[PDB]
Symmetry: D2
Subunit: 416 residues, 4 copies
């Protein structure tokens, strides 16, 4: 009825003795507040069921959520960690491009997308590479960043703090405070910029196999606590002052790197360019120069000297539990093509991606389906013997798959 239901709710034995309708009655009349539903209802799926039911009555079409699935999904690894106000899950089709012949190994790359032909095209690119003797890649740099903004009374004071951070002694003190927060914390050279009394400080460090935002933030907050002891008039405006730079386009990531900086390359014989890619080396180069270099230049691109790196980065990231919003900066790529061999008929190809933001532990990689795709690549979880090696390998795979994707689309655009 209503009164009886509240007696049963407050009875230490609880909400599981009420029906869905009785609980909703109690919400509509203002006896139980919308937010408290999380702790009161026992099972996670039943919490989702009720939130959906409440939501449906507020929609102009109450049957809207019919085909949004929710049942029998492991919400235990999601509640309090990955999502709030959960009403179900969104299934994204997963496909496989491979084998990807990279650094003398073969990889079957999972790709989550709803764009027709993207996987097939990426697959034909892998085929060209494989018959061409495989690709090779190198991690050139490694370190996630966080770029807080502090304010001092005057610009002369901000300059003083900058000079202090650049002394051997001052940096060593900040480094100890940063490095004390974690096993993996290992602060690299600080990069700083002034704008008046503003001072942007870019902390960079490895972070084992995790993407590292949480870890770099704990090291950063304690590093600024130490800096405040030497400069007590300094104010910390924001733990992020956009100098990182995270999830926005920025030259600083392209130039300094962020996360993993990777280069990949292959040489495709003329015969493979002809039979797999249906074009010539000469035609490919002409398209690459005038589209990926000259065209991006006329559009005023910073870091966007590629055909569709973002397609590959986004499909792999969604499949592999990465933060897909980091496609903004992680897609940064320059794709170069030149003639190779004795008569300039073989295609040399390289992709350079200075800011791959990636990890195999933490965040979405804690969910089991996301982990199935990480296991396909042999990169799931933390590498105990060699910390960071799995995330490094996953970066290489992304760069190699991007190259495969650049090969195929460019050959398609070359013919017509």
């Amino acid at each position: 009825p209503n009164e009886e239901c509240l007696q049963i709710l407050g009875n230490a034995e609880g909400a599981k003795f009420l029906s869905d309708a009785e609980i909703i009655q109690l919400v509509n009349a203002k006896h139980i507040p919308a937010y408290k539903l999380e702790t009161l209802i026992e099972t996670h799926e039943r919490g989702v069921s009720i939130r959906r039911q409440l939501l449906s009555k507020k929609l102009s079409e109450p049957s809207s959520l019919q085909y949004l699935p929710y049942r029998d999904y492991n919400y235990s690894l999601v509640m309090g960690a990955c999502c709030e106000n959960v009403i179900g899950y969104m299934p994204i089709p997963v496909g496989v491009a491979g084998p990807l012949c990279l650094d003398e190994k073969e990889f079957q790359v999972p790709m989550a997308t709803t764009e027709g032909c993207l996987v097939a095209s990426t697959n034909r690119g892998c085929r060209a590479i494989g018959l061409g003797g495989g690709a090779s890649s190198r991690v050139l740099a490694d370190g996630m960043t966080r770029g807080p903004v502090v304010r001092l009374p005057r610009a002369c004071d901000s300059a003083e703090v900058k000079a202090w951070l650049e002394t051997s002694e001052g940096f060593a003190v900040i480094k100890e405070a940063f490095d004390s927060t974690s096993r993996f914390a290992r602060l690299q050279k600080l990069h700083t910029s002034i704008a008046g009394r503003n001072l942007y400080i870019r902390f960079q460090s490895r972070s084992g196999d995790a993407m590292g935002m949480n870890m770099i933030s704990k090291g950063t907050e304690k590093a600024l606590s130490k800096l405040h002891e030497y400069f007590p008039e300094m104010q910390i405006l924001a733990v992020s002052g956009n100098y990182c730079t995270d999830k926005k386009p920025a030259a600083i990531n392209w130039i300094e790197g962020r996360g993993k900086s990777v280069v990949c390359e292959a040489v495709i014989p003329a015969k493979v360019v002809r039979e797999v890619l249906k074009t010539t080396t000469e035609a490919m180069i002409e398209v690459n120069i005038n589209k990926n270099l000259v065209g991006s230049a006329m559009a005023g691109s910073i870091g966007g000297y590629n055909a569709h790196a973002a397609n590959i980065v986004t499909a792999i990231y969604i499949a592999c539990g990465q933060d897909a919003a980091q496609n903004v900066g992680s897609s940064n790529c320059i794709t170069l093509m030149e003639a190779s061999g004795p008569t300039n008929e073989d295609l040399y190809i390289s992709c350079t991606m200075p800011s791959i933001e990636i990890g195999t532990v933490g965040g979405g990689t804690n969910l089991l389906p996301q982990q199935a795709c990480l296991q396909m690549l042999g990169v799931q979880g933390a590498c105990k013997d060699n910390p960071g090696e799995n995330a490094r390998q996953l970066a290489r795979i992304v760069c190699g798959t991007v190259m495969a994707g650049e090969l195929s689309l460019m050959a398609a655009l070359a013919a017509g």
Copy 2:
């Protein structure tokens, strides 16, 4: 046919270099084939695949399919936008993102609501052609800028589809390269394939006037699609949108745990000065990409287009009788979006579109559903900016 054989027998046929009548059994066999090639043969255990509607995916949205990836969906709302309320779905695995955005919606609702406008509408495709000499490409640019030249090109472009309605051309020369940016609305479709078809016919017509022209590529990165580029920021691409709200001083204190004065200081020195020092083009915001990407995954959009669709400048100012109220606006000139085609043909993705009342084509007013979804995106972005900026202020 294949139904009279077992799994092991069909697999024997594939291994000897030599069809299946259900989509799901096709998926199963591909998974078994793939699993023998992996170092951990059990790695696919927790990748689900059963009972998914593969009939709308095969031959349309994905190839070599081995299952699906579940992304948790949460709701941020109610979002009070243009005298209406929306419950915004957000597919994400980042803890706190949905809660933070939800808090931004709460501040906006208590402050009277947000208001938005679509400022421009047209998807683009930017091919690169070339002529024997730069003088020749200059002749072609000139011809295209005459009203008679543009009219014959518009006639060719427009004949390919109902919604193909060529707007003003934008051209750029680099030596004998000519980059031509074609632009048009596309109903409620995002419109890539449609504009591509109009482009092919228009260039074919241009060749009749200029036979020495070579079409080097149907995209010469002048569009620009899925790469950062100032041209999308300055000219727009897809929907250009602005949203705004005024948040009373009291609400900023109670819901957001800061003050108007503090919000302004952080916005200016983070989203304007900070982004400036970082050398940003179009990234003058805190985390528009989090909300764009989450809404996109949930609503069947092309998540790769978060690259350009995330472009956003966030501005905060003093407001009201005593300058204690918080004016906020987000401006997003290049939201690339649609409610038909691509991932929006799938049923779960269509559930999230039905939530917002923007699913499929609007018959009475073509494009209105895609326009409305772009406004919701800009409003949900503004909500997400409100809260995170407030969190960073404290």
Copy 3:
């Protein structure tokens, strides 16, 4: 003053007849305040025509700075020959540019085209709300709205002919980019006059509009900006030439294949790694700056006027000939007004056959000068790139 002494006038102030004595007195007054009173010893000031400078080109004038002018030519451009003046203090610059001119000449000369023409100004206005700024953008975009604004703008001057508007919104800010030719003048003052009269007219339709500044940096004038690269500003120009393989080896001391390699990997890839917007060239700014100083241009406008993409590819039957092109979207320039009122810089404009207004075809002298700047830049690219390729 005529009956007084240099010293008595100086004591009057502490406690004029001609311009040169006004300069002499200012120099002496200033020399008192310097730690080294004889600093101005070798700063020349005598026998300079100060009448055209006062109240027009410079204030508090203590003299003038001599910048060596050298000549690079002949430059065979559009079947004409040009002796290009270059005011510089950088050694080897004129000499290198000259070698590039010689290379082009032996390849049959350069061809250029003006692709677009219109100086801009980009005010920022504010409305009470973003919805009001959007209403104004929409109004400006209708044919009737644009026509009202065009009539206003065009009424201020005989050369004021308003082209298509370009606008951008940022909340309640609206940025409006006005564009028009301006005869042979660079045209900032003219464009500004037309802009303010047009904004006044816009205010009659939208009284709540606040005009924040007549430049809101949307122009964009004398700062690096992608809008100039993509939409253009002033004159947009392309120049090209084909250098025979024999000329590349003999005059330039390199090969076609080596030139293409250096250009791709320095001017495209290198500039791309450096995060350049509009700087896809070797040293356009050197040539631009030198011509500008010599021809009475606003040298500060070298910021955007130097915007350039230099391309090189194989040409001819053998694929051994060198094709070169420079594309310069935003050359800001004029042959009337400002520093081109002065007689010495007019001498340099007279060398080029472009001094003053073109009466038969207004704007044609400024266009011609922009073609010369782009051609001379291409010559400078040719030579510096050759020298980088051959490597000492």
Copy 4:
């Protein structure tokens, strides 16, 4: 050749008895006169050089050093803006320009700064750069070279080869970027008081010679691969700095903003945010978050014998304005300029008229007891004068009319 006449030498070249442009070796003031006379008859108007000055100017320091094929010189009017009250000092700033009202406006900016207790500046960083592109057979090999250059022992070997070419050559930390088999190497060092291009180029070439021993396969494609970056707009100069990075600031009392600048603190903050931050942002600027730094930079440079072409990057500036004081009524202003490329020795600073302008500011030539102090000081004057210019123009725009 002095025993012949003008008309005779010209008759010899026209008749082709003597090679034309190989005559000024046999013949400086008269060498110019003959080049002009020969040149005038090739022109559509043979009297066009009439009013181009050439007599009574020292061409000896100019010939084979600053200019070639010289036909005269171009006078640029020089105004003075001052006193500029900067770091407890007072400067009279030479500004060579032909733009009306520029000197006057900058002057009003100086006047407001002086009446607000003056400005303060700091050099934040210092070092000229050169950014060659080298090529290895493969990206993997280019990666090898980048890892080697990053080891402390690889760096010291390169640092010793770099520092050997000059006493001022002190190589700072190397910055590298890979693009396939391309490696771009940004060499940076102080250069005393010189702007330092030729000096850094010397040390770079020797340094690459050393690197060529450890990796014989390396091709030096070009001594500049645009990674410096010199005389083109580039985010790398904005983010890393180049030449001198400098910051300047002052507080203008409210009353001074009203009486001298004819506006208010509130109006100035508003215009600055929406023009120099938001406006530049909408226009797609990297490094151009200012009103007209280029005007001031260009004018000082021309007057002081700097390379005016380097105004492209030297003008990079962000101008910030903010409420100051107890009632938020005073104006805080600051200009940050990360890439002022400048020098007081070498190039155009060797010419005497240019040296007079340098002497005016007390920075001509080398500072013997503190090397580089004169160029640093000039950099600070540039940034201070830029801030004066921003003050005045922004107030003019804020008021209107």
